Design a protein around this ligand. Sequence first.
Ligand SMILES: CC(C)(C)NC(=O)[C@@H]1CN(Cc2cccnc2)CCN1C[C@@H](O)C[C@@H](Cc1ccccc1)C(=O)N[C@H]1c2ccccc2C[C@H]1O
Ligand SMILES: [Cl-]
Ligand SMILES: [Cl-]
Lengths: 99, 99
Amino acid sequence: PQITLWKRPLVTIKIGGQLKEALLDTGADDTVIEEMSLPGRWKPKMIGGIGGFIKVRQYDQIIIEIAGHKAIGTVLVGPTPVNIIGRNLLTQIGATLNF
Amino acid sequence: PQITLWKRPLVTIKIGGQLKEALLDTGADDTVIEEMSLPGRWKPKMIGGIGGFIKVRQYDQIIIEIAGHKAIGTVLVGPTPVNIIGRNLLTQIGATLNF
Ligand SMILES: CC(C)(C)NC(=O)[C@@H]1CN(Cc2cccnc2)CCN1C[C@@H](O)C[C@@H](Cc1ccccc1)C(=O)N[C@H]1c2ccccc2C[C@H]1O
Ligand SMILES: [Cl-]
Ligand SMILES: [Cl-]
């Protein structure tokens, strides 16, 4: 689809068997989801936002369906105020910014 | 252009006669620039992201060029970690996300 930017570009995702709303975020290097369980091993990470850093758990090789499009990649889980689809997964669904 | 997301979507902007690097950020509601001088009066604003909030100075009706495209709109100034072009100006220049 073509998504305009008049409002936040929120879409439905499926991750870990769960449906969530998430933001398509070209400024985000990484994908960051609110607290949930994911399978496999994880390691801690600190990631930096405009207001400082938060501690997250990093899970690799996680499948996500983003507005109907499947992708696999690293997903960070922690106390993010909104669920964020970052560039590591936007690339996989073929998302571009156009003007 | 059509900008892919394999790398950060950094572009050159022009504000106050000077060239700066800035991030095209669909996840940002507003545009916020590192400390610089802008004309006129400012209003207070708090902006929140990952990690919490920062206090910024809001300047309205500022002339700004984004990757060659002319805009006139609200620019926030404050201790942002990187210069960010958000949706208020991305809409002005006609930007969309496409996949
Ligand atoms: C991986 C992670 C998510 C941590 N990345 C970011 O937060 C980066 C940080 N850099 C910076 C960085 C920090 C440390 C190291 N390298 C880089 C600047 C750009 N952000 C990306 C932003 O798009 C993230 C959004 C998230 C958000 C959206 C809505 C509500 C809450 C949080 C963001 O912070 N957006 C906010 C935002 C942004 C600008 C202006 C106004 C507003 C309000 C709000 O829309
Ligand atoms: Cl990845
Ligand atoms: Cl591509």
